[PDB]
Amino acid sequence: MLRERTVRLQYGSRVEAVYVLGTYLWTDVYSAAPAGAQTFSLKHSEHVWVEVVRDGEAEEVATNGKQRWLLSPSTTLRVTMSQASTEASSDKVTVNYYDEEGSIPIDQAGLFLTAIEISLDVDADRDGVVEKNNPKKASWTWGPEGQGAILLVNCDRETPWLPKEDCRDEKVYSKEDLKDMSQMILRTKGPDRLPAGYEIVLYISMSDSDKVGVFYVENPFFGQRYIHILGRRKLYHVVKYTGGSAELLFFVEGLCFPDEGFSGLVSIHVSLLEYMAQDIPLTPIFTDTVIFRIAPWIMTPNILPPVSVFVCCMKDNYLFLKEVKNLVEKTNCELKVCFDRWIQDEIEFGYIEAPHKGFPVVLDSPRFPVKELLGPDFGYVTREPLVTSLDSFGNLEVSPPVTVNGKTYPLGRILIGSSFPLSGGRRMTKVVRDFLKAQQVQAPVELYSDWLTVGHVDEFMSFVPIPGTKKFLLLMASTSACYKLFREKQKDGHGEAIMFKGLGGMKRITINKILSNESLVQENLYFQRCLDWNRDILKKELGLTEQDIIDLPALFKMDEDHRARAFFPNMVNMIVLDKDLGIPKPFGPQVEEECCLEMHVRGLLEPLGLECTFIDDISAYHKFLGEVHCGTNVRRKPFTFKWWHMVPSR
Numbered sequence: 001m002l003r004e005r006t007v008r009l010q011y012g013s014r015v016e017a018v019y020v021l022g023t024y025l026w027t028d029v030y031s032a033a034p035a036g037a038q039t040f041s042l043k044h045s046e047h048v049w050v051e052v053v054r055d056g057e058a059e060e061v062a063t064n065g066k067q068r069w070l071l072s073p074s075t076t077l078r079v080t081m082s083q084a085s086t087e088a089s090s091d092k093v094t095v096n097y098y099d100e101e102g103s104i105p106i107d108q109a110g111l112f113l114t115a116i117e118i119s120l121d122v123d124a125d126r127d128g129v130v131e132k133n134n135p136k137k138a139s140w141t142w143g144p145e146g147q148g149a150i151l152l153v154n155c156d157r158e159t160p161w162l163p164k165e166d167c168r169d170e171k172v173y174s175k176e177d178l179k180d181m182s183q184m185i186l187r188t189k190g191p192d193r194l195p196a197g198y199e200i201v202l203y204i205s206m207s208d209s210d211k212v213g214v215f216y217v218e219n220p221f222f223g224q225r226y227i228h229i230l231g232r233r234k235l236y237h238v239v240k241y242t243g244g245s246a247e248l249l250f251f252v253e254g255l256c257f258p259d260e261g262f263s264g265l266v267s268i269h270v271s272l273l274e275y276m277a278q279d280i281p282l283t284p285i286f287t288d289t290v291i292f293r294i295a296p297w298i299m300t301p302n303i304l305p306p307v308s309v310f311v312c313c314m315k316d317n318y319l320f321l322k323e324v325k326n327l328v329e330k331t332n333c334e335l336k337v338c339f340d341r342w343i344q345d346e347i348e349f350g351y352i353e354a355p356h357k358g359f360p361v362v363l364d365s366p367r368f369p370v371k372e373l374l375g376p377d378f379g380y381v382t383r384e385p386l387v388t389s390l391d392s393f394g395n396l397e398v399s400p401p402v403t404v405n406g407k408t409y410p411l412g413r414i415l416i417g418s419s420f421p422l423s424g425g426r427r428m429t430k431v432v433r434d435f436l437k438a439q440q441v442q443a444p445v446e447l448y449s450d451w452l453t454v455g456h457v458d459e460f461m462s463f464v465p466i467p468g469t470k471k472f473l474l475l476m477a478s479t480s481a482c483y484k485l486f487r488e489k490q491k492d493g494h495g496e497a498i499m500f501k502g503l504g505g506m507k508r509i510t511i512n513k514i515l516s517n518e519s520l521v522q523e524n525l526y527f528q529r530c531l532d533w534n535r536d537i538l539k540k541e542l543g544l545t546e547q548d549i550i551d552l553p554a555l556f557k558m559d560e561d562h563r564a565r566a567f568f569p570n571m572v573n574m575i576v577l578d579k580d581l582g583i584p585k586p587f588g589p590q591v592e593e594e595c596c597l598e599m600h601v602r603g604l605l606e607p608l609g610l611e612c613t614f615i616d617d618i619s620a621y622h623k624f625l626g627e628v629h630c631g632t633n634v635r636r637k638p639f640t641f642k643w644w645h646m647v648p649s650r
């Protein structure tokens, strides 16, 4: 009893009204009084509480009292009920009107009430059970103390017959599909029927009609069928009312991720409608509302435990396959192989989670859906066609959880390679950046990757965990680290060491030849400035100190556009399987039958408990022109931190 509703008595006639629990009536008795009438008394039934209110002061009135009050516009009734009517109910309020003369009433106005309970319930407290009429169910708030029901995008595929994800249609073919959906229960209590002229309607806005699907299970105790009642091209649905205590169970699916202009919030309504007449719209005399937040797409940083490694390459790349298999066998992970870097630049494994359910979701941006991917509890979302090389999951990274100036990012931050504002350089397309920002929970940061020919952040940075700790390291490519090492080996008398040994397609490149190349030195000094510009952003935006950064030797060649391409394989772009790192084999100068780049990287990483395996992904091609033709992608366990416990900035 909190919402006040105006119900007036009608001159002489009797008014019959449905009373919805959780509301109360203010009732005008003065306008219905006959002319000249001076006082009024009233009767009412047991389950109707009635107060006379005389200038804001309310008085509780007995059921069968003979008390009279002076008729005044400022004297009214407040009518409240707390139990729903049954078939044996006669819930009424009766007003008698007296003139100044006698004590026998001169007219009588009546209010006849049918009390029903209506409540559209969702799991706004996020425990996977639909509580009864959560008071905050019509709002959605972030944080551990926040509330509001969560909805998944139903983008997996329960049956392989149809080609697209489940939410692409308005059908449910398998009852296993319901496990992905959020439950919404219409709870009602009342008599066998609604009084004449009323109906209960579920509805959504046209805008939300491509955001949700709402289904009902028919004949659950035999051959089950699932009816689409709200969503695409279905804005409302007249509910069949059942008397007594009734619950109608609905299943809600999300159809759309948060994006530019869609915040993730969707509303479903139930209204009790009153039939006024033909040609008049039905009046909504009571409306209950629930809100859902569609769960965002979340990316998984390298610090999360690996579940399975996805590998794409050619069928005769035996060295690569063997070493990746050896690497994965040091771990508990599964290996999945597909027979150039599309598995790393075109595909990205993220996940979605609600309190009741969650599963991995892969986004695909072609430059056909990978068959070894979409399926049960594996979501697959493809980009809508119609970009530069910066539009690539290679130009996207996600950091480990970080705290920055007291502001925590419990799911890390997405990093996007870009150019300088006034540069006129390349930039990831606005649709991609807007989509990532719209997910909110991994507050993206733009880096500087347009100094690279390909333009991907994974060409110069990565994160590894520190084994046995909750800490991580940022790995940065470093040309200065490479020149320091080479000048050292040259001073040590190894200037004639040859690079790219074991690659017959490659030039007689030595350390001496590299150090004597003045043009190459200037180029890599400039590229170090580009790396250091990114270093400063990462430290600022991720809360890093110099103690959290390892510089791995790298070397670049400048092209006509003044952009860098790897001189030898970029070791920073590695497979991170907890303590086990699969590092691209550099093919550096060999000092004592051992690559001096390999031994240097081992000296940097192994003291930290990291185990280095160098993977050869180029020997099958016989030469390196800056391109990796093999890809890998790791599906990781989701964060234990639930995204809805976060508090993003406004």
Ligand SMILES: N[C@H](C(=O)N1CCCC1)C1CCN(c2nccc3c(-c4ncc(Cl)cc4Cl)cccc23)CC1
Pocket (backbone or CB within 6 Å): 153, 154, 155, 165, 167, 168, 255, 256, 257, 259, 363, 364, 365, 381, 382, 383, 384, 390, 391, 392, 393, 394, 395, 396, 431, 432, 435, 436
């Ligand atoms: N309506 C869709 C939706 O929610 N569903 C459709 C099927 C069921 C659920 C949305 C999916 C996301 N859509 C994208 N918007 C920006 C980007 C995208 C990328 C991408 N491509 C490249 C990079 Cl580097 C980064 C990214 Cl995120 C891949 C893939 C889709 C994308 C916007 C439409």
Ligand SMILES: [Ca+2]
Pocket (backbone or CB within 6 Å): 122, 123, 124, 125, 126, 127, 128, 129, 130, 131
């Ligand atoms: Ca609940």
Ligand SMILES: [Ca+2]
Pocket (backbone or CB within 6 Å): 165, 166, 167, 168, 169, 170, 171, 172, 173
């Ligand atoms: Ca479907």
Ligand SMILES: [Ca+2]
Pocket (backbone or CB within 6 Å): 154, 155, 156, 157, 158, 166, 176, 177, 180
């Ligand atoms: Ca599904």
Ligand SMILES: [Ca+2]
Pocket (backbone or CB within 6 Å): 156, 158, 176, 177, 179, 180, 376, 377, 378
């Ligand atoms: Ca599923």
